[PDB]
């Protein structure tokens, strides 16, 4: 926002040399130095030098590959097939399971939603509904908005799990899919997949499991020695699709994710086919046409580099860190932890002061946390980066000091960003907030 | 042969890279210049630069502008540069997207929501028959009706037919600069007349042509029609940096004449427990590496670079066009002024020519409705100097075929012809599903 350099607003009359381009780029990259010292929530999952170098070289070897042309790039076609099958194995899908590589968790979610809309249409459902917990990702609303589907969000329990009784009452003759999250992003709580799947089986409704965030942790937890309370994978009868982000705890480059299905019969509905196009018979498996095959190469590289032993070890370290932080953060007067988080995310509240004061303060001390709402809350997401750099001690100390400071003045009005997130929740005119967002989006592209 | 599960033990870097060389052992085909379109430069030094640029921004993600303010600036700049190239002026604006499909999808979604705002229940896209398949995806995904209007003998949209296709439900008009099948530019001024008269948004699909058409005049090859924001009624443009921008795959632009239109493409969830959610495009997390590399390509070529590149492509196109017009047995559809040349034949089955060119080691694009094949000339093709060889092989292929013009088409060539003549569209749809299934096979 406050840039210290003029904007390039047109193409240069004379193209720059390679060295000059890369030297000018240094000015932009030096601006982006907030994550390297382990002070950002989520965002960068490993960021390690030797890993980066491998992933960029792998990308580089496949820079011009485009899986739209599998006759030209059969090697890339085999890499993507292998990525999918590795994932189906990790989720114990067996030989009938299938999937596709996508650009991210959002596309993974949208693809399943679209698949289930088209199946519902085929069964005479005029306006399909998504039935989802309040905590399910925003991408489910985007799918509703994009694909013309009604979305019903059901309330959560005191422990921030979906209320299954309420979910039952939300089901109707028009329900196209059920959703649960492993875990939900806000508070890092795993929904009770078996209980939701019971409904899915009883009412004959597809069930999508959102494992975008947890996928490349939860798959390894048992082997890491941290067993979970609930099963989450294709072994659970009624689970019809899973989303999972390689680009989160797979340590794959950005622009990589999977949508997996229990059966090809489901995946078929996600496909787009135009048999009549002048430009040839056109069939795409996902949203994009042209895609960056380099990213798929690098994603395959991450997986083959970590292996089972690497992801188990990475999981062990993230979970050790999170369990330590969670037990400490439970013994601080003035805050509480929402629910009982078993993975990498911890959400905090305060019954004693405005919790956004803590996000404001920690921002000041060089930390970047996520700011939630409904109810008022903040979270941090623990990554390999955070375990590697051992920021856990300093995080705690800054949390403790901040809380003591706030506590000296518990009713002192809340300022800056914290104020906006507070007031936004109380504003009865939702369009005010919407209009505030559109200004923020515009401001992203500003060159003034 | 197939890796079907995670290795128990991770491979070392070197071992990973050594294994990956197995997958990259077919690139000589494209590298030799034998592939239609597909790779637009491929040039070694350019690749090194773009991969380094990507590498500097590998972990950047524009969902987090506060963390990566450098990427943010980069993307604002790519959009402003592109707006200048299309002479949009200060009120024009745009977004970086993942490719041309997403650019088309975004504009369609923008126009749908604006039509919803005016009480229209099922918004209609009015498009030429030649418009890209992505417009049918848009319709399918977003619940819009697509009306495809016929072409003239020159393969341009029939503008009278297009007017007759307009209804109270029309949300957008489309034309292409050029359309992908025949490489013909639609008469943008004439379509913009309708847009203005009936107050309908108009989207210009410049995904393919974008980073040629903007330089044509300066290359010394003035086009017949104007195409950019200076044309009254053009409300948006899609343009692929990953084609004639020579940018990495994963890179395209959607540009608007005014901010008011772009506001309709955005997604906002103010109520999400995870926080106020506002995304400009389809994706959430995105690869900022690709944007960095897209900026690098723009800054590396500059105006002089792209003018010179455009010169080299069009010289090659105009030569091949004049030569393919002087070959007994074949004709070229319409009058292509850019990088795509489409061939047909009234003397034999055109797919035989694709058969023989495939055997000679060339990969051309097979079209349909009507039976046709095309080549897309890229900067790679010009650097490799393949045009003469290309011509020689076409001539020999035609000469041969013309000895038995009425012989039965075999191979894929037959599939392409049968496909169009089948009465049950379904059977064709199923072959496609089966093809797509096969992409993901590990058997």
Q: What is the rounded distance in angstroms from the CA atom of residue A98 to the CA atom of residue B127?
A: 35
For residues B345 and B330, give the distance between their C-alpha atoms in angstroms, rounded to a whole number: 4
Q: What does the angle CA B426 – CA B427 – CA B428 come to, to the nearest 5 degrees? A: 85
Q: Which helix (H) or strand (E) holds A176?
A: strand A175-181
How far CA A121 is from CA of A146, A175, A273, B125, B225, in Å, comes to 16, 11, 17, 22, 43
Cis peptide bond upstream of A271, omega within 30: no
- Please identify which residue in the block is written with the tokens 């960003």: A417
Bridge-partner residues for B335, per DSSP? Answer: none
Is A418 a member of any domain?
A: no
Q: Is residue B355 part of a domain?
A: no
| Number of neighbouring beta carbons within 10 Å of residue B155 | 25
Residue A28 near residue A4 (C-beta atoms within 8 A): no
Give the DSSP letter of residue A270: G
Chain A residue at shortest CA distance from B83: A10
Instruction: Tell me the C-alpha distance between B398 and A295, whole Å.
Output: 41
Under a CB-based contact definition with an 8 Å cutoff, are residues B113 and B133 in contact? no
Q: Does B367 touch chain A (CB under 8 A)?
A: yes
Give the side-chain half-sphere CA count within 13 A for B208. 22
- CB count in 10 Å sphere of residue B179: 30
Residue A96 CB neighbours (<10 A): 12
Q: How far is A343 from chain B (nearest CA, A)?
A: 17
Task: Give the whole-angstrom CA distance, residue A203 versus residue A170.
Answer: 12
A371 touches chain B (CB under 8 A): yes
Q: In Å, how far from its chain's centre is CA A252?
A: 13
Residues B22, A198: Cα–Cα separation, whole Å: 45
Contacts of A79 in chain B (CB under 8 A): 23
Give the closest of A64, A253, A284 to B287, CB-based: A253
Non-local (6+) Cβ contacts of A50 within 8 A are B13
Q: Is residue B205 part of a domain?
A: yes
Under a CB-based contact definition with an 8 Å cutoff, are residues A12 and B297 in contact?
no
B152: CB partners within 8 A, 6+ apart: B158
For Cα atoms B295, B298, B299, give the angle at the middle one, nearest 5 degrees. 85
Residue that has been written with the tokens 């294994």 in this structure: B19
Give the number of residues written for chain A.
448
Specify the residue for token string 């799990």. Answer: A161
Nearest chain B Cα distance for residue A272, angstroms: 7
Tell me the three state secondary structure of residue A111: helix
Burial class of residue B440 (count of CB atoms within 10 Å of its CB; 0-12, 13-18, 19+): buried
Does B147 contact chain A (CB < 8 Å)?
no
Q: Does A148 touch chain B (CB under 8 A)?
A: yes
d(CA B390, CA B382): 12
Give domain status of residue A288, yes or no: yes
| Chain B residue with the nearest C-alpha to that of A77 | B439
Question: How far apart, in whole angstroms, are the C-alpha atoms of residue A150 and residue B152?
Answer: 42
Partner-chain contact B109 A146, CB within 8 Å: yes
Chain B residues with CB inside 8 Å of A292's CB?
248-250, 287, 290
Distance CA A385, CA A317 (A): 10
Q: Which domain holds residue B210?
A: 53-297
Q: How far is CA B339 from CA A412, B179, B402, in A?
A: 67, 11, 27
Long-range contacts of A396-405 (CB under 8 A, 24+ apart): A396/A325, A396/A328, A396/A329, A398/A362, A398/A365, A398/A367, A399/A329, A399/A332, A399/A358, A399/A362, A400/A332, A402/A358, A402/A361, A402/A362, A402/A365, A403/A332, A403/A333, A403/A334, A403/A335, A403/A358, A405/A361
For chain A, the straight-line distance linking the first and the last C-alpha, in angstroms and rounded, comes to 10
Using DSSP bridges, classify how beta strands A129-133 and A175-181 pair: parallel, antiparallel or unpaired.
parallel
Nearest-CA neighbor of B397 among B349, B365, B333?
A: B349
CA distance B250 to chain A (A): 5
Mutation pick from B283, B297, B306, B362 vs chain A, by most beta carbons of A within 10 Å, is B283
Q: Is the dihedral angle over the CA atoms B277, B280, B283, B288 positive or is it negative?
A: negative
Of B295, B278, B251, B78, the C-alpha closest to A445 is B78
DSSP strand pairing (B170-176 vs B202-205): parallel
> Rounded to an integer, what distance in angstroms lies between the CA atom of residue A272 and that of residue B137?
7
Q: What is the resolution of this structure in A?
A: 1.8
**Alpha-carbon torsion angle B73, B77, B80, B81, nearest 10:** 180
Q: Nearest 5 degrees, angle CA B26-CA B32-CA B36?
A: 90
Most distant CA pair in chain B, distance: 72
**Sign, Cα dihedral of A36, A41, A42, A43:** negative
Q: What is the DSSP letter of A287?
A: S
The closest CB to that of A28, out of B70, B100, B105, belongs to B70
**A227 occurs within a structural domain:** yes
| Residues of B with Cβ-Cβ distance to A184 under 8 angstroms | 273
CA B62, CA B70: separation in Å to the nearest integer? 10
Spatial distance between the Cα atoms of A378 and A364, rounded to a whole number of angstroms: 15
Q: In this structure, are strands A336-337 and A345-349 parallel, antiparallel, or unpaired?
A: antiparallel
| B31 and chain A in contact, CB less than 8 A | no
How far is B300 from B379, CA to CA, in rounded Å?
15
Distance of CA B413 to the CA centre of its chain: 24
In whole angstroms, what is the distance from residue B303 CA to residue A126 CA?
52
**Angle separating helix axes B100-117 and B134-142, nearest 10 degrees:** 40
Residue A229, classed as helix, strand or coil, is coil
Domain of B58, CATH number, reads 3.40.640.10
B105/A25 touch (CB, cutoff 8 Å), yes or no: no
Contacts of B42 in chain A (CB under 8 A): 64
Closest chain A residue to B13 measured between Cα atoms? A54
A80 vs B207: CA distance, rounded Å: 26
Query: Contact at 8 Å (CB) between A422 and A414?
Result: yes
CB A140 within 8 A of CB A170: no
Q: Is A396 on the interface with B (CB under 8 A)?
A: no
Q: Retrieve residue B172's tokens.
A: 């957008």
Q: Beta partners for A127? A: none
Experimental method: X-ray
Packing angle between helix A293-329 and helix A74-90, nearest 10 degrees? Answer: 30
In 10 A of CB A233, how many CB atoms? 21
For residue A270, the number of C-alpha atoms closer than 13 Å in the C-beta half-sphere is 28
What one-character-per-residue DSSP string does A41-58 give? SSS-S---HHHHHHHHHH
Q: DSSP letters of A65-106? A: --TT-TTT-HHHHHHHHHHHHHHHHHTT--TT-EEEEESSHH
- Answer yes or no: are the C-beta atoms of B142 and A147 closer than 8 Å: yes
Tell me how far apart the alpha carbons of residues B13 and A373 are, in angstroms, rounded to a whole number. 43
Taking CB atoms and an 8 Å cutoff, what residues of chain A touch B137?
Answer: 272, 274, 284, 287
CB A294 within 8 A of CB A101: no
Q: Which of B72, B229, B295 is nearest to A446 (CA)?
A: B72
Kindly state the tokens that stand for A125: 């459902």
Residue holding tokens 């000589």? B28
Q: How far is CA A275 from the centre of its chain?
A: 34
- Cβ contact A134–B290 (<8 Å): no
DSSP 3-state of A394:
helix
CA gap B373, B393 in Å, rounded: 15
- SS3 of chain A: helix, strand, coil, percent, to 5: 45, 15, 45
Chain B CB within 8 Å of residue A60 CB? yes
Q: Token pair for residue B158?
A: 């029939």
The overall longest dimension of chain A from CA atoms, in Å, is: 72
User: What domain count does chain B have?
Assistant: 1
Q: How far is CA A223 from CA A220, A226, A243, A315, B207, in A?
A: 5, 7, 21, 9, 48
Kindly report the number of other CB atoms within 10 A of residue A392's CB atom: 18
Alpha helices in A159-292 (DSSP H): 164-170, 193-202, 215-218, 221-224, 264-267
Q: How many angstroms separate the CA of residue B188 from the nearest CA in chain A?
A: 20
The answer to whether position A419 is within a domain reads no
Q: How far apart are CA B203 and CA B176, in angstroms?
A: 8
Show residues of chain A in contact with B48, CB under 8 Å. 18
In the block, tokens 């044509």 appear at: B216
| Most A CBs within 10 Å, among B30, B43, B59, to test the A interface | B59
Within a domain: residue A231? yes
Q: Is the dihedral of CA A52, A55, A60, A64 positive or negative?
A: negative
Three-state SS string over chain B comes to CCCCCCCCCCCCHHHHHHHHHCCCCCCHHHHCCCECCCCCCCCHHHHHHHHHHHHHCCCCCCCCCCCCHHHHHHHHHHHHHHHHHCCCCCCCEEEEECCHHHHHHHHHHHHHHHHHHCCCCCCEEEEECCCCCHHHHHHHHHCCEEEEECECCCCCECHHHHHHCCCCCEEEEEEECCCCCCCCCCCHHHHHHHHHHHCCCEEEECCCCHHHHCCHHHHCCCCCCCCCCCCCCEEEEEECCCCCCCCCCCCEEEEECCHHHHCCCCEEECCCCCCCEEECCCCCCCCHHHHHHHHHHHHHHHHHHHHHHHHHHHHHHHHHHHHHCCCCCCEECCCCCCCEEEEECCCCCHHHHHHHHHHCCCECEECCCCCCEEEECCHHHHHHCCHHHHHHHHHHHHHHHHCCCCCCCCCHHHHHHHHHHCCCHHHHHHHHHHHHHHHCCCC
**Cβ atoms A357, A418 nearer than 8 A:** yes
Distances (CA, A) of B136 to B16, B103, B171, B185, B264: 40, 14, 14, 20, 20
- Cβ-based contacts of B272 with chain A (< 8 Å): 138, 141, 373
Cβ contacts of A15 within 8 Å, gap of 6 or more:
B299, B300, B301, B302, B303, B304, B305
Asked if residue B352 belongs to a domain, the reply is: no
The two three-digit tokens of residue A341, written as one number: 């988080």
Q: Which residues pair with A258 in a beta bridge?
A: A101, A244
Structure tokens at A396: 């705690």
Residue A415: Cβ within 10 Å count: 11
């Amino acid at each position: 926002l406050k840039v210290d350099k003029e904007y390039v607003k047109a193409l240069p009359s004379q193209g720059l040399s390679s060295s000059a381009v890369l030297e000018k780029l240094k000015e932009y990259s030096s601006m982006d130095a907030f994550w390297q010292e382990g002070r950002a929530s989520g965002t960068v999952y490993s960021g390690e030098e030797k890993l980066t170098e491998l992933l960029v070289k792998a990308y580089g070897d496949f820079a011009w590959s485009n899986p739209l042309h599998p006759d030209i790039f059969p090697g890339l076609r085999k890499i993507e097939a292998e990525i999918v099958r590795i994932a189906c194995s990790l989720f114990n899908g067996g030989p009938d399971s299938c999937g596709c590589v996508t650009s991210g968790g959002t596309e993974s979610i949208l693809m399943a939603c679209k698949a289930y809309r088209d199946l519902a249409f085929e069964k005479g459902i005029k306006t399909p509904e998504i039935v989802a917990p309040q905590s399910a990702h925003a991408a489910f609303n985007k799918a509703a908005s994009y694909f013309g589907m009604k979305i019903v969000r059901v309330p959560l329990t005191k422990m921030m799990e979906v209320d299954v009784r309420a979910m039952r009452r939300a089901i109707s003759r028009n329900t196209a899919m059920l959703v649960c999250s492993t875990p939900q992003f806000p508070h890092g709580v795993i929904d009770p997949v078996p209980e939701v799947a019971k409904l899915a089986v009883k009412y004959k409704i597809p069930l999508h499991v959102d494992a975008c965030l947890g996928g490349f942790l939860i798959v390894f937890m048992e082997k890491a020695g941290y067993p979970l309370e609930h099963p989450f994978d294709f072994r659970v009868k009624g689970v019809t699709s899973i989303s999972a982000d390689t680009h989160k705890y797979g340590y794959a480059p950005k622009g990589s994710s999977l949508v997996l299905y229990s059966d090809k019969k489901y995946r078929n509905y996600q496909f787009f086919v135009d048999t009549d196009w002048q430009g040839g018979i056109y069939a795409s498996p996902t949203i994009a046409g042209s895609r960056p095959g380099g990213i798929s190469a690098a994603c395959w590289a991450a997986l083959m580099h970590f292996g089972e032993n690497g992801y188990v070890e990475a999981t062990k370290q993230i979970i050790k860190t999170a369990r330590f932080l969670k037990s400490e953060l439970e013994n601080i007067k003035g805050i509480f932890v929402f629910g009982n988080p078993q993975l990498s995310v911890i959400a905090l509240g305060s019954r004693d002061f405005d919790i956004y004061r803590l996000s404001n303060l920690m921002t000041a001390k060089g930390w970047n946390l996520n700011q939630l709402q409904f109810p008022p809350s903040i979270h941090f997401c623990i990554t390999l980066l955070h375990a590697r750099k051992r920021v856990a001690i300093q995080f705690l100390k800054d949390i403790r000091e901040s809380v003591t400071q706030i506590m000296k003045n518990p009713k002192a009005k809340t300022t800056g960003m914290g104020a906006i997130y507070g007031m936004a929740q109380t504003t009865v005119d939702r369009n005010m907030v919407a209009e505030l967002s559109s200004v923020f989006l515009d401001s992203l592209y500003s060159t003034d």
